[PDB]
Amino acid sequence: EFAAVDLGSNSFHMVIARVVDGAMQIIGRLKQRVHLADGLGPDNMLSEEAMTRGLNCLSLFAERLQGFSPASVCIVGTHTLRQALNATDFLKRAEKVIPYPIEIISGNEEARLIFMGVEHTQPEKGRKLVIDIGGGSTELVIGENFEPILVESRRMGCVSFAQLYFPGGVINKENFQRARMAAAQKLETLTWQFRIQGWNVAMGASGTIKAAHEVLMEMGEKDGIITPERLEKLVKEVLRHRNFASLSLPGLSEERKTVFVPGLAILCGVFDALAIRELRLSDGALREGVLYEMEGRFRHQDVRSRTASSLANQYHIDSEQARRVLDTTMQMYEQWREQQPKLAHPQLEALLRWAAMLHEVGLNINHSGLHRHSAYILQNSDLPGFNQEQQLMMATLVRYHRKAIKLDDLPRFTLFKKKQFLPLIQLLRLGVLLNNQRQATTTPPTLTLITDDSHWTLRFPHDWFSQNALVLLDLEKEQEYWEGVAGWRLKIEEESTP
Amino acid sequence: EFAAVDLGSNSFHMVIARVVDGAMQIIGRLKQRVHLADGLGPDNMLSEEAMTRGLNCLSLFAERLQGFSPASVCIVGTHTLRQALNATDFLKRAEKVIPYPIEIISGNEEARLIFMGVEHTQPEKGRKLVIDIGGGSTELVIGENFEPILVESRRMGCVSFAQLYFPGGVINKENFQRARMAAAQKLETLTWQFRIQGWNVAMGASGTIKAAHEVLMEMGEKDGIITPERLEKLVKEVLRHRNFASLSLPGLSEERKTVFVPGLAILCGVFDALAIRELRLSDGALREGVLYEMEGRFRHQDVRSRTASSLANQYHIDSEQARRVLDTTMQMYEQWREQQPKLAHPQLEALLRWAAMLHEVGLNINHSGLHRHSAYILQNSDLPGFNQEQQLMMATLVRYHRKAIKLDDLPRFTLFKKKQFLPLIQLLRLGVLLNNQRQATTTPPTLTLITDDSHWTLRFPHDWFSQNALVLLDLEKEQEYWEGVAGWRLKIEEESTPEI
C-alpha cells in the first residue's frame, strides 16, 4: 500500500495504491485546492495565509495516511516550492502536521516523472510528446517505451502569466497575444530540436489541458482531439468576455475561470512552436510517475543507478579506481556504523556510495581543483531519480573529498543533519587518500577504525608503513587537515610486535 | 630574427634564432640566475629584493632584444609567477623595463612546451620520457613524433626544496632522505601510468640535471649517462659535507652549490618513482618549445585551433550552431572594428572567434545556466597553446554571453583593457541571441551596426521584424539588460526605405 503526494501551484494532490499479482491498482485519490502560488509575491515569499491553508491540507492528508510507514509514502514539491525563498520555513512547519518529508524536485525531474506517469497510465505504443501546463511551470518531453529522449521545463504557468499579461483579470486580443507570443518565446531554443525528433502521438496532462478539452466537447466538437483549428475556436470564445470573472464558458468551474485564459495562451504558444496537429488528454501525470517510481524501487529498480553509471561513461571515469575507493570507504563505513548505529541511515549510505563512485567525475576538466570540478558537475547536472537535496548532498560529499577543508560554506539540508553526514565526508576523504597510488596501491589486509565522536583512530597491520612510506606521509597531511575542523582529530596506529 | 624568453624560478633564459630556407638557425642562448623563487615569503608575496633582481635581468634582456618587434618576441612566466600573489605588481613594473608582455603559462602548458623543445632539438626517433627539474616546478612528459601523450607538472623544485628540507643550507642524511621521499610522494598518482606507457629513451633538461651530468663526468664515469647507481655515488659525495656553503664537489659553480642538493634529491625521487635506468641530457627545453611554436604561428600553425576542435569533439558541440553564431558575431565585429580600429587587436579577435565557437561547451552539464557551465569548463580545463590570460579572457566572454550582466564582477587582466574587450562581450551577446532558433533561424540579408561609444544601433532590413517577432522580443530583453549597464545603450531599427 503506497501513496504519492504532489504539492503543486494550484492544488495539492494525493493517490493511494496497492500492487496485486504485480499489477498496480488505485485505492483512493485526494485533491485540495490550496492555491500555494497565489501567496507568492514580488519578493518570492509565500504568504502566511497560503502557508496556513497548505498546513491544513497536509494535516488532512496525514489523517488519510495514518499508519503508513515513511517507506510507503513520497511527497514531492515543484515550481512554487522551488521558487519560494521561505520554502524551508514551510517545510519545517509541515514537519508537525505530516510525518513524511517533503522532497523538492527540479523542473527536469518533474518533467521526467510526468512523462513516466503518462506512459504508465496511457499504455499506447509509439514515440510520445508529453505536455503539462501547470500553475507555475510547463513541462515538455519526447520519449518512447519509458525512456525519455528530450526533457525540458520552462518557468511559465497560468498563475504567473495571469499577473504578467492579464492585469486585474482583463481579457482582450492584445493581452492574449502578448501572453501567447511570450509562451512561444520561451520555446524558441527547442522547437527545431523537438520537431526534428518528432512524435507518433502527443499527450497533454493536468488542469489547463483538461479544461480546454472539456470546453471543446461542450461547444460541439465531435471528438476529444485538440487541434490548432479547435484552439482558435477557444480563443474566439474567450475574447467574447471582458474579464476572468465573467468568463462564462460551458464546463468551466468557478476556480478554473481564474486561470483558464493564461493557461490557454500557453497552450496556443506550445502548439504554435511545436506545430502539434493532434493532442489527446492523459489521465496520468506527476503523481502517477511518482507512484510507479517508488514501487520500482521496492523491486530494486532505481533509475539513480543508471544515472550514476551513465555519468561514469560521459566523463570517462576510471572504473577500477572508483571501485578501489568505494571498497576502502565502505570497509570503514561498516565499522563507523557499528560504533554509532543511531547516526547511520541507508539513504545517506547510498549517497556516500555514489560519491565514492563519482569523486573523479571532474577529472577530465582538471586534476587541479578536482574536488571543486567534480562537485560543480554533480551540483549542476540533470540527475534522473535524484531530488534536490540528494543531488546537493552527493555534490557536497565530493566537494570536500581532498585538500584543505573549512566547512564555513556547508549548505543547510532539511532532509539530512550534520551529525549524520559529516562522518561520511571523513570516510570518503580517507577512502580516496588511501588509494592515491591507483593501480600501485597496496591495500592493507586489515584496517581497523576506532571512533570516539569525531576523534578517529586508523590501525594498520604490524610494520605496514615500512613498505608504504608514501601512504604514511599522506595520512600525516590528513591529520593536519583535520586540525582545522573543530572536533575532528585523526590518529594513526599500527598493530604491535606480535 | 626572433626570440623566446622564459622567466623561471632559478634562471631566466633566452634563445635567439632565425629561419634559413626552412631550417631553424640558432643564433644564441642565454641563461642567467635570478633565483626569483627565493623571494616568495610565507604569504606568497614576492619580496622587493627578488622583484629588483628580476627587473634588473629584464632590463638587460630588453637591451639584448633592441630592435626586436613585439611579434618577434615571446616571454613566458612559470612557477614563481604562478605562485606570487603580487605577480601583477611585478608584471606592471616590468612594463617599464622591457616592452614585451609577460605571458604566465600553466604547469601543464610549460610541460608541453618543454617536451616540444626536446623533440625539436633532439631529432632522434622513439617515444621519449622528458624530465625537467626547475627552481620551482618539475615537469614529466611522455610523448612521441612531436605529440605529448602524458603531461604532468608538480610543485617541487631546487629552490623551493632548499628552504623546505634544508633550512640554513644544512646537509645531512635525514634532510636529504626527507627531500627524496617528498619528491616521490608528489609522483604517487602517475608512476604506474607512466611506467606502463614506457619510453625508448629518457631525456633530462635544465640546470640540476646538467650539473649532475657534469659532476659524474668529472668523477670519471666512462659515459655521460645518469643511472641509479651513479646517483647513489653523487648522494654519497654530497653527504660528506655539512652545508651548501662547503659543498666542494668538482664541477659545481658557486651559484649551483646553493641549489644542487635539493635538486639532486628531487632527481633521485624521480628515478625511484619512474624506475629510470638511463637519463640522457637534452640541451633543448622550454625556451626552444616557445621558439618553435612562435615559428609555426608565423606560418599560421597554431595548436590552439587543434585545442578548440578537440574541445568541440570532446563535448559534442553542435558545429552548425557554432558556425552560425561565429558568422553573425564576426559580421558585426568587422563593422565595430572599422568604426574604432585602434581598439581592435588580432589576439582578442582570435579569442572572440573561439568564444563563439565554444559557447555551448557546457551544454552536457545543463541547458540552464549554460553561460556559467561553459565558462567553468573553459576557465578550468587544460587548453594547449593558451596562456593564462588568454584562457581566462575567452572564458569571460562566454561567461557574459547571456542573462543579466554585472561588469563589477569582471576579473582583472594585465594584457587586456576593458575598452578593448567589453565590445567583444556586446558582440557575442548579440551574435548568440540572433541565433536562438538554431537551424530554424532566419538570417537577415543585411545587418548594420552603428556605434557611438557604447551606445549601439542595430539596423535590420525594411519591415524585417513583421516576419521575425520572437527575435524582436529577444532584442527587447537585451535592450533592458544594457539599460542596467552604465554607458551601454541598445537601439533597434529597421531600414526605412521600401523596396519592390
- Chain B residues with CB under 8 Å of A382 CB are 366
Q: Which residue of A has its CA nearest to B379?
A: A365
How far apart, in Å, are the Cα atoms of A458 and each of B2, B426, B429?
Answer: 59, 57, 55
Question: Which is nearest to B241 in space by CA: B341, B155, B173?
Answer: B173
Distance CA B469, CA B447 (A): 17
Give the closest residue to B199 by CA, choosing from B254, B262, B150, B127.
B127
Task: Residue A88: count other Cβ atoms within 10 Å of its Cβ.
Answer: 14
Closest CA to B360 of B351, B348, B372, B350: B372
User: Would you state the cell numbers that stand for residue B418, as one nine-digit string?
Assistant: 576593458
CA distance B469 to A178: 11
For residues A19 and A1, give the distance between their C-alpha atoms in angstroms, rounded to a whole number: 7
Show Cβ contacts of residue A424 under 8 Å, excluding neighbours closer than 6 positions: A333, A348, A351, A352, A355, A397
A interface with B, Cβ–Cβ < 8 A, is 152, 181-182, 184-185, 188-189, 191-193, 196, 314, 364-369, 373, 376-377, 380-382, 436-440, 469-470, 473-474
The C-alpha atoms of residue B73 and residue B16 are separated, in whole angstroms, by 9
Instruction: Decide if B484 contacts B403 (C-beta within 8 A).
Output: no
Q: Taking Cα atoms as reference points, which of A157, A73, A80, A154 lies closest to residue A111?
A: A154
| Grid cell locating B444 | 537577415
**What 8-state DSSP symbol labels residue A316?**
T
Side chain identity, residue A429: R
- Nearest CB partner across the interface for A188, out of B191, B369, B470: B470
Residue B109 neighbours by CB under 8 Å, 6+ apart: B382, B384, B385, B386, B387
Handedness of CA A321, A324, A327, A330 (dihedral sign): negative
What is the least distance, in Å, from the CA of B499 to any CA of chain A?
28
Nearest to A133 by CA among A249, A246, A279, A4: A279
CA distances from A74 to A96, A111, A286 (A): 17, 17, 12
Contacts 24+ apart (CB under 8 A), B472-481: B473/A181, B473/A182, B473/A185, B474/A185, B474/A188, B474/B433, B474/B434, B474/B436, B475/B433, B478/B429, B478/B430, B478/B433, B481/B403, B481/B404, B481/B405, B481/B429
Of all residues in chain A, what percent are helix, strand and coil, respectively (each to 5)? 50, 15, 35
In A, which residues are within 8 Å of B438 by CB distance?
189, 192-193
Distance CA A159, CA A259 (A): 6
A-chain residue closest to B195, CA distance:
A440
Phi and psi angles of residue A125, each rounded to the nearest 5 degrees, phi first: -70, 165
> CB–CB of B185 and A473 under 8 A?
yes
What are the C-alpha distances in Å from B417 to residues A272, B2, B73, B393? 45, 27, 21, 11
Is residue B152 within 8 A of residue B159, CB to CB? The reply is no
**Nearest-CB residue to B470 (from A184, A369, A470):** A184
Q: In b/e form, how buried is each residue of B303-320, taking b as 16+ CB within 10 angstroms? A: bbeebbeebbeebebeee
Within B122-201, residue ranges assigned H as helices are 160-165, 173-186, 191-197
Q: Which residues, 6 or more positions from A351, have their beta carbon under 8 angstroms from its beta carbon?
A: A390, A393, A394, A397, A424
A192 chain-B contacts, CB cut-off 8 A: 437-440
- The cell for B105 is 603559462
* Residue A189 with chain B: CB contacts under 8 Å: 367, 436-438
State how far the Cα of B215 lies from the Cα of B227, in Å rounded to an integer: 13
When scoring A106, A314, A368, A470 by the number of chain B Cβ atoms within 10 A, the one with the most, hence best to mutate, is: A470
Cα distance between residue B95 and residue B102, in whole Å: 9
* SS3 call for B251: coil
Which of B367, B369, B377 minimises the CB distance to A365? B377
Specify the long-range contacts of residues A472-475, CB closer than 8 Å, at least 24 apart: A473/B181, A473/B182, A473/B185, A474/A433, A474/A434, A474/A436, A474/B185, A474/B188, A475/A433
Residue type, A54: G
The span from the CA of A458 to the CA of A80, in Å, is 47
Alpha helices in A32-189 (DSSP H): 48-64, 79-83, 87-94, 107-121, 158-165, 173-187
Q: What DSSP assignment string belongs to B7-44?
A: E-SSEEEEEEEEEETTEEEEEEEEEEE--GGGGB-TTS
CA B116, CA B30: separation in Å to the nearest integer?
19
- Chain A residues near residue B366 by CB distance under 8 angstroms: 380-382
Between B188, B192, B380, which is nearest A369 by CB?
B380
How is residue B104 written as a grid cell? Answer: 604566465
The residue of chain A nearest to residue B440, with distances taken between CA atoms, is: A192
| Grid cell listed for A59 | 494535516
Q: For residues A134 and A158, give the distance between their C-alpha atoms in angstroms, rounded to a whole number.
A: 7
Supply φ then ψ for residue A316, to 5 degrees. 50, 55
Asked whether the beta carbons of residue A366 and residue B373 sit closer than 8 angstroms, the reply is: no
Over the Cα atoms of chain B, what is R_g? 26
**Chain A residues near residue B151 by CB distance under 8 angstroms:** none
Q: How far is B471 from chain A (nearest CA, A)?
A: 9
CA distances from A183 to A178, A186, A274, A404 (A): 9, 5, 11, 47
**Is residue A406 within 8 Å of A134, Cβ to Cβ?**
no
Neighboring chain A residues of B110 at a CB cutoff of 8 Å: none
How near does any CA of chain B get to the CA of A364, in Å?
A: 8
Residue in chain B nearest A155 by alpha carbon: B368
The answer to whether the CB of A169 falls within 8 A of the CB of A162 is yes
> Which residues from A are below 8 Å from B470, CB to CB?
181, 184-185, 188
Q: Regarding beta strands B23-33 and B11-20, do their DSSP bridges make them parallel or antiparallel, or are they unpaired? A: antiparallel
Residue of B nearest to A151 (CA): B367
Contacts of B469 in chain A (CB under 8 A): 181
Please name the residues in contact with A407: beta carbons below 8 A apart, sequence gap of 6 or more: A400, A422, A485
In the numeric block, which cell numbers belong to residue B224?
Answer: 655521460
Which of A152, A381, A470 minimises the CB distance to B184?
A470
Q: How far apart are CA A355 and CA A374, in angstroms?
A: 10
Q: Rounded to a whole number, what is the distance in Å from the CA of A157 to chain B's nearest CA? A: 18
For every residue of A268-311, DSSP letters joined together read HHHHHHHT-S-BEE-S--HHHHHHHHHHHHHTT--HHHHHHHHH
DSSP A444: P
**Partners of residue A473 in chain B, C-beta under 8 Å:** 181-182, 185
The cell for A115 is 512523462
Grid cell locating A88: 524551508
- Backbone breaks in chain B after residues (C–N over 2.5 Å): none
CB A367 within 8 A of CB A83: no
Cβ atoms of B450 and B456 closer than 8 Å: yes
C-alpha cell at B381: 580545463
A211, A137 contact by CB (below 8 A): no
Strands of the sheet with A12-20, listed across from one edge: A23-32, A12-20, A2-7, A73-77, A102-104
Residue A230: all three cell numbers together:
479547435
Neighbours of A39 (CB within 10 A): 20
List the single best residue of B188, B315, B465, B480 to mutate versus A (max A Cβ within 10 A): B188
Chain A partners of B185 at a C-beta cutoff of 8 Å? 470, 473-474
How far, in Å, CA of A6 to CA of A290, rounded?
9
* Interface contact B440-A376, CB threshold 8 A: no
CA distance A257 to A239: 13
- Cβ burial of A375 (10 Å; 0-12, 13-18, 19+) is buried
Q: Taken in order A232, A237, A242, A245, is the CA torsion positive or negative?
A: negative
- Cell output for A37: 502560488
Cβ contacts of residue A10 below 8 Å, gap of 6+?
A: A33, A34, A35, A36, A37, A134, A135, A158, A159, A207, A259
- What is d(CA B56, CA B98) in angstroms, rounded to the nearest whole number? 10
Cell numbers given for B234: 653523487
Write phi, then psi, for B324 (nearest 5 degrees). Answer: -55, -50
Identify the closest residue of chain A to B365 by CA–CA distance.
A381
User: Cell 632584444, residue?
Assistant: B65
- Residue A133: enclosing H or E segment and its boundaries? strand A128-133
Length of chain B, please? 500
Nearest to B436 among A152, A188, A474 (CB): A188
Name residue, grid cell 541547458: B367
Which chain A residues have a beta carbon less than 8 Å from that of B474?
Answer: 185, 188
Q: How far apart are CA A297 and CA A283, in angstroms?
A: 23
DSSP 8-state code for residue A461: P
* Torsional sign, CA A71, A76, A82, A87: negative
Method used for this model? Answer: X-ray
- Report the DSSP beta bridge partners of residue B467: none
Given a contact cutoff of 8 angstroms between Cβ atoms, the answer to whether B389 and B419 are in contact is: no
Report helix, strand or coil for B144. Answer: strand
Tell me how far apart the alpha carbons of residues B368 and B375 are, in angstroms, rounded to a whole number: 13
Contact B380 A364 (CB under 8 A): no
Counted across chains A and B, CB pairs separated by less than 8 A come out at 73
* Contact (CB<8Å) A440/B182: no
Place of cell 500553475: A135
* Distance to chain B for A301, nearest Cα, Å: 25
Distance CA B415, CA B426 (A): 20
The C-alpha atoms of residue A350 and residue A394 are separated, in whole angstroms, by: 9
Question: Residue B188 is nearest to which of A189, A369, A436, comparing CB atoms?
Answer: A436
Rounded Cα gap, residues A235 and A172, in angstroms: 10
Q: How far apart are CA B428 and CA B326, in angstroms?
A: 9
Q: Is A150 helix (H, G, I), strand (E, B) or coil?
A: strand
Cβ atoms of residues B211 and B135 within 8 Å: no
How far lies B101's CA from each of B71, B93, B363, in Å? 11, 11, 34
Question: Across the interface, do A373 and B380 touch by the CB < 8 Å criterion?
Answer: yes
Please answer whether residues A171 and A261 qualify as being in contact, where contact means their C-beta atoms are separated by less than 8 angstroms.
yes
Q: Whose grid coordinates read 502548439?
A: A271
Alpha-helical segments (H) within B362-448: 370-380, 388-399, 418-433
Give the DSSP letter string of A195-228: HHH--SEEEEESHHHHHHHHHHHHTT-SSS-B-H
Asked whether the beta carbons of residue B367 and residue A152 sit closer than 8 angstroms, the reply is yes
Report yes or no: B24 and B17 within 8 Å, Cβ to Cβ: yes
Helix spans in A299-409 (H): 303-314, 319-339, 346-358, 370-380, 388-399
Domains (range + CATH), chain B? 1-105+285-299 (3.30.420.40), 106-284 (3.30.420.150), 300-445 (1.10.3210.10), 446-500 (3.30.70.2260)
Q: Nearest-CA residue of chain A relative to B321?
A: A189
A41 vs A7, A36, A45, A77, B283, CA distance in Å? 18, 11, 6, 18, 71
Cβ(B354)–Cβ(B383) under 8 Å?
no
Contact: A181, B473; criterion CB under 8 Å: yes
Give the whole-angstrom CA distance, residue B465 versus residue B480.
18
Cα three-residue angle A338-A340-A341, rounded to 5 degrees: 70
Q: How far apart are CA B117 and CA B132, in angstroms?
A: 11
Q: Which residues of B touch A (CB under 8 A)?
A: 181-182, 184-185, 188-189, 191-193, 314, 364-367, 369, 372-373, 376-377, 380-382, 436-440, 469-470, 473-474
Side-chain half-sphere CA neighbours of A206 within 13 A: 33
Our CA angle for B436, B359, B111, nearest 5°, is 170
Mutation site, B155, B187, B473, interface A, largest A CB count within 10 A: B473
Kind and range of the H or E run holding B112: helix B107-121
Resolution (A): 1.9
CB contact under 8 A, A193 and B376: no
